[PDB]
Protein backbone atom coordinates (compact mmCIF):
# COMPACT_ATOMS: atom_id res chain seq x y z
CA UNK A 1 0.00 0.00 0.00
CA UNK A 2 1.60 3.29 1.27
CA UNK A 3 3.27 2.02 4.66
CA UNK A 4 7.04 0.61 4.03
CA UNK A 5 10.11 2.25 3.99
CA UNK A 6 14.14 1.76 3.67
CA UNK A 7 16.42 0.66 5.09
CA UNK A 8 18.75 2.56 7.94
CA UNK A 9 21.55 3.66 5.22
CA UNK A 10 19.13 4.90 2.47
CA UNK A 11 17.71 6.77 4.66
CA UNK A 12 21.14 8.49 7.10
CA UNK A 13 22.20 9.31 3.35
CA UNK A 14 18.94 11.09 2.39
CA UNK A 15 19.24 12.82 5.59
CA UNK A 16 23.11 13.47 4.51
CA UNK A 17 22.30 15.79 1.54
CA UNK A 18 19.42 17.41 3.67
CA UNK A 19 21.30 20.30 5.23
CA UNK A 20 19.27 19.63 8.99
CA UNK A 21 21.39 15.99 9.08
CA UNK A 22 25.15 15.98 7.79
CA UNK A 23 27.71 12.98 8.91
CA UNK A 24 31.45 13.70 8.80
CA UNK A 25 32.75 12.57 5.49
CA UNK A 26 35.52 14.87 4.93
CA UNK A 27 38.14 12.77 6.12
CA UNK A 28 36.58 9.20 5.43
CA UNK A 29 39.11 8.48 2.52
CA UNK A 30 42.22 9.92 5.10
CA UNK A 31 43.24 6.56 6.61
CA UNK A 32 46.75 6.55 6.68
CA UNK A 33 46.63 10.16 7.41
CA UNK A 34 44.49 10.75 9.91
CA UNK A 35 46.27 9.15 12.20
CA UNK A 36 49.04 11.05 11.98
CA UNK A 37 46.74 14.31 10.90
CA UNK A 38 45.83 14.00 14.68
CA UNK A 39 49.47 13.31 16.03
CA UNK A 40 51.11 16.28 14.63
CA UNK A 41 47.46 18.17 15.46
CA UNK A 42 48.03 16.67 19.30
CA UNK A 43 51.65 17.91 18.80
CA UNK A 44 50.85 21.57 17.80
CA UNK A 45 48.40 20.95 20.23
CA UNK A 46 50.65 20.47 23.34
CA UNK A 47 53.08 23.00 21.33
CA UNK A 48 50.43 25.75 21.96
CA UNK A 49 49.22 24.34 24.82
CA UNK A 50 53.22 24.65 26.88
CA UNK A 51 53.19 28.19 25.03
CA UNK A 52 50.27 29.32 26.07
CA UNK A 53 51.36 28.39 29.39
CA UNK A 54 54.65 30.14 29.14
CA UNK A 55 52.96 32.98 27.55
CA UNK A 56 50.71 33.76 30.54
CA UNK A 57 53.78 33.26 32.64
CA UNK A 58 55.23 35.78 31.15
CA UNK A 59 51.65 37.65 31.44
CA UNK A 60 52.58 37.79 35.01
CA UNK A 61 55.71 39.85 33.86
CA UNK A 62 53.19 42.03 31.35
CA UNK A 63 50.84 42.15 34.55
CA UNK A 64 53.63 43.59 36.88
CA UNK A 65 54.96 46.26 34.38
CA UNK A 66 51.60 47.38 33.66
CA UNK A 67 51.32 47.11 38.07
CA UNK A 68 55.11 49.27 38.58
CA UNK A 69 54.00 51.24 36.03
CA UNK A 70 50.55 52.08 37.35
CA UNK A 71 52.37 52.79 40.61
CA UNK A 72 54.44 54.92 39.14
CA UNK A 73 51.57 57.04 37.63
CA UNK A 74 50.10 56.98 41.55
CA UNK A 75 53.57 57.63 42.81
CA UNK A 76 53.81 54.48 45.39
CA UNK A 77 57.16 54.05 45.20
CA UNK A 78 57.61 51.87 48.26
CA UNK A 79 56.00 49.36 46.78
CA UNK A 80 57.34 50.00 43.61
CA UNK A 81 60.35 49.25 46.01
CA UNK A 82 59.04 45.96 46.62
CA UNK A 83 57.74 45.50 43.45
CA UNK A 84 60.73 45.86 40.82
CA UNK A 85 62.38 43.65 43.66
CA UNK A 86 59.95 41.13 43.32
CA UNK A 87 60.05 41.33 39.41
CA UNK A 88 63.98 41.12 39.37
CA UNK A 89 63.94 38.10 41.93
CA UNK A 90 61.62 36.83 39.14
CA UNK A 91 63.19 37.43 35.81
CA UNK A 92 66.58 35.51 38.13
CA UNK A 93 64.50 32.84 39.49
CA UNK A 94 60.91 32.79 37.11
CA UNK A 95 61.72 29.95 34.68
CA UNK A 96 59.60 31.33 31.96
CA UNK A 97 62.28 33.79 32.21
CA UNK A 98 65.43 31.20 32.08
CA UNK A 99 63.71 29.44 28.75
CA UNK A 100 62.67 32.94 27.10
CA UNK A 101 65.12 34.14 24.19
CA UNK A 102 68.02 36.10 24.59
CA UNK A 103 66.23 39.56 23.41
CA UNK A 104 63.23 39.45 25.08
CA UNK A 105 65.15 39.13 28.22
CA UNK A 106 67.34 41.96 27.01
CA UNK A 107 64.04 44.67 26.39
CA UNK A 108 62.91 43.34 29.44
CA UNK A 109 65.96 44.29 31.22
CA UNK A 110 65.95 47.75 29.55
CA UNK A 111 62.62 48.70 30.17
CA UNK A 112 63.02 47.22 33.69
CA UNK A 113 66.06 49.73 34.38
CA UNK A 114 64.49 52.67 32.45
CA UNK B 1 58.76 37.34 22.60
CA UNK B 2 61.35 39.65 21.14
CA UNK B 3 60.89 42.89 23.04
CA UNK B 4 59.35 44.46 25.38
CA UNK B 5 56.71 45.67 23.32
CA UNK B 6 56.15 42.02 22.57
CA UNK B 7 55.41 41.59 26.14
CA UNK B 8 53.25 44.78 26.04
CA UNK B 9 51.27 42.45 23.81
CA UNK B 10 51.89 39.41 25.52
CA UNK B 11 48.94 39.13 26.90
CA UNK B 12 47.65 39.86 23.15
CA UNK B 13 50.17 36.82 21.73
CA UNK B 14 48.18 34.97 24.78
CA UNK B 15 44.90 35.72 22.99
CA UNK B 16 46.08 34.54 19.67
CA UNK B 17 47.27 31.57 20.91
CA UNK B 18 44.61 30.97 23.12
CA UNK B 19 42.92 31.41 19.40
CA UNK B 20 45.21 28.70 17.80
CA UNK B 21 44.61 26.37 20.91
CA UNK B 22 41.05 26.70 20.34
CA UNK B 23 41.34 26.51 16.43
CA UNK B 24 43.35 23.27 17.16
CA UNK B 25 41.32 22.13 19.75
CA UNK B 26 38.51 22.68 16.81
CA UNK B 27 40.58 20.73 14.41
CA UNK B 28 41.21 17.85 17.05
CA UNK B 29 37.52 17.66 17.62
CA UNK B 30 36.64 17.81 13.93
CA UNK B 31 39.42 14.73 13.41
CA UNK B 32 37.92 12.27 16.05
CA UNK B 33 34.27 13.29 14.05
CA UNK B 34 36.61 12.26 11.00
CA UNK B 35 37.80 9.12 12.78
CA UNK B 36 33.97 8.83 13.94
CA UNK B 37 32.72 9.10 10.05
CA UNK B 38 35.30 6.32 8.98
CA UNK B 39 33.11 3.64 11.08
CA UNK B 40 29.56 2.96 9.27
CA UNK B 41 29.03 2.51 13.40
CA UNK B 42 29.31 5.42 15.19
CA UNK B 43 27.48 7.77 18.40
CA UNK B 44 25.61 9.64 15.29
CA UNK B 45 23.10 6.51 14.72
CA UNK B 46 19.86 6.75 12.99
CA UNK B 47 17.86 8.71 15.49
CA UNK B 48 16.16 11.25 12.64
CA UNK B 49 16.09 7.56 10.46
CA UNK B 50 15.28 6.08 13.29
CA UNK B 51 12.04 8.55 14.21
CA UNK B 52 11.14 7.57 10.14
CA UNK B 53 11.67 4.32 10.33
CA UNK B 54 9.80 3.85 13.95
CA UNK B 55 7.04 6.39 13.09
CA UNK B 56 7.00 7.70 9.86
CA UNK B 57 5.76 3.53 8.83
CA UNK B 58 2.17 5.74 9.16
CA UNK B 59 0.92 8.54 7.25
CA UNK B 60 -0.17 10.19 10.76
CA UNK B 61 3.35 9.22 11.92
CA UNK B 62 4.91 11.22 8.41
CA UNK B 63 3.04 14.14 9.75
CA UNK B 64 4.60 13.84 13.22
CA UNK B 65 7.53 13.53 11.19
CA UNK B 66 7.86 16.15 8.92
CA UNK B 67 6.23 18.47 11.24
CA UNK B 68 8.70 17.95 14.08
CA UNK B 69 11.28 15.54 12.97
CA UNK B 70 11.32 17.01 9.06
CA UNK B 71 10.19 16.37 5.86
CA UNK B 72 11.95 14.52 3.49
CA UNK B 73 11.35 13.26 0.10
CA UNK B 74 9.48 10.16 1.15
CA UNK B 75 6.55 12.71 3.01
CA UNK B 76 6.22 14.06 -0.30
CA UNK B 77 5.19 10.78 -2.04
CA UNK B 78 3.29 9.59 0.68
CA UNK B 79 1.05 12.88 0.74
CA UNK B 80 1.22 12.13 -2.98
CA UNK B 81 -0.40 8.64 -2.52
CA UNK B 82 -2.34 10.38 0.17
CA UNK B 83 -4.17 12.74 -1.77
CA UNK B 84 -4.16 10.56 -5.08
CA UNK B 85 -6.30 8.37 -2.68
CA UNK B 86 -8.39 11.09 -1.78
CA UNK B 87 -8.80 12.36 -5.20
CA UNK B 88 -9.82 8.73 -6.13
CA UNK B 89 -12.21 8.71 -3.16
CA UNK B 90 -13.55 12.16 -3.64
CA UNK B 91 -13.69 10.82 -7.37
CA UNK B 92 -15.74 7.50 -5.98
CA UNK B 93 -17.94 9.94 -4.45
CA UNK B 94 -18.48 11.79 -6.86
CA UNK B 95 -19.39 9.94 -9.60
CA UNK B 96 -21.42 8.06 -7.43
CA UNK B 97 -23.37 11.04 -6.99
CA UNK B 98 -23.18 11.77 -10.37
CA UNK B 99 -24.61 7.74 -10.53
CA UNK B 100 -27.60 8.59 -8.65
CA UNK B 101 -28.46 11.32 -10.34
CA UNK B 102 -28.19 9.73 -13.22
CA UNK B 103 -30.58 7.36 -11.77
CA UNK B 104 -33.01 9.90 -10.67
CA UNK B 105 -32.76 11.30 -14.30
CA UNK B 106 -33.34 7.35 -15.67
CA UNK B 107 -36.89 7.68 -16.13
CA UNK B 108 -37.52 11.46 -16.46
CA UNK B 109 -38.71 10.93 -20.38
CA UNK B 110 -35.80 11.81 -23.08
CA UNK B 111 -37.70 14.18 -24.20
CA UNK B 112 -37.32 16.63 -21.54
CA UNK B 113 -33.71 16.52 -21.63
CA UNK B 114 -31.69 19.11 -23.92
CA UNK B 115 -28.58 18.94 -25.88
CA UNK B 116 -27.57 21.74 -22.79
CA UNK B 117 -28.66 19.34 -20.66
CA UNK B 118 -26.55 16.31 -21.88
CA UNK B 119 -24.26 18.56 -22.30
CA UNK B 120 -24.02 19.90 -18.79
CA UNK B 121 -23.68 16.60 -17.20
CA UNK B 122 -21.37 15.64 -19.91
CA UNK B 123 -19.22 18.85 -18.79
CA UNK B 124 -19.66 17.31 -15.09
CA UNK B 125 -18.28 14.29 -15.85
CA UNK B 126 -15.59 15.10 -18.26
CA UNK B 127 -14.81 17.31 -15.05
CA UNK B 128 -15.45 14.75 -12.82
CA UNK B 129 -12.77 12.63 -14.65
CA UNK B 130 -10.58 15.29 -14.75
CA UNK B 131 -10.54 15.16 -10.62
CA UNK B 132 -8.77 11.83 -10.86
CA UNK B 133 -5.22 12.26 -12.42
CA UNK B 134 -3.30 9.35 -13.73
CA UNK B 135 -0.93 7.54 -11.42
CA UNK B 136 1.19 4.80 -12.76
CA UNK B 137 1.04 2.70 -9.21
CA UNK B 138 0.21 -0.96 -9.48
CA UNK B 139 -3.01 -1.51 -8.32
CA UNK B 140 -3.91 -1.74 -4.80
CA UNK B 141 -6.63 0.49 -4.07
CA UNK B 142 -6.91 2.01 -7.47
CA UNK B 143 -8.79 -1.11 -8.84
CA UNK B 144 -11.59 -1.33 -6.52
CA UNK B 145 -11.74 2.50 -7.65
CA UNK B 146 -11.22 1.49 -11.22
CA UNK B 147 -14.36 -0.58 -11.02
CA UNK B 148 -16.56 1.71 -9.47
CA UNK B 149 -15.05 4.37 -12.05
CA UNK B 150 -15.83 2.21 -15.21
CA UNK B 151 -19.30 0.57 -13.76
Redesign the interface.
Same mark, same amino acid.
Given at each position: ??????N?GE??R??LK?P??L????? =?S??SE @?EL??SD @? @?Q =??AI??N??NI @??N??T??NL?KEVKTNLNILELENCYYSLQSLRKKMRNNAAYLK??F??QQ??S??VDT | ????????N??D??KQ??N??NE??S??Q?????????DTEVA?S?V??QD??EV????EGLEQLRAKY?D???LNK?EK??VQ?TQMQAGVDKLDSFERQLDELAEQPPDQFTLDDVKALHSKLTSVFATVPQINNID??YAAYNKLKSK
Open positions: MESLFPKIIELDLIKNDSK =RNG @LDS @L @L =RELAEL @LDLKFLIQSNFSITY | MNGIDDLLINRIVQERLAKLNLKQSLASNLEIAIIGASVGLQILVAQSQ
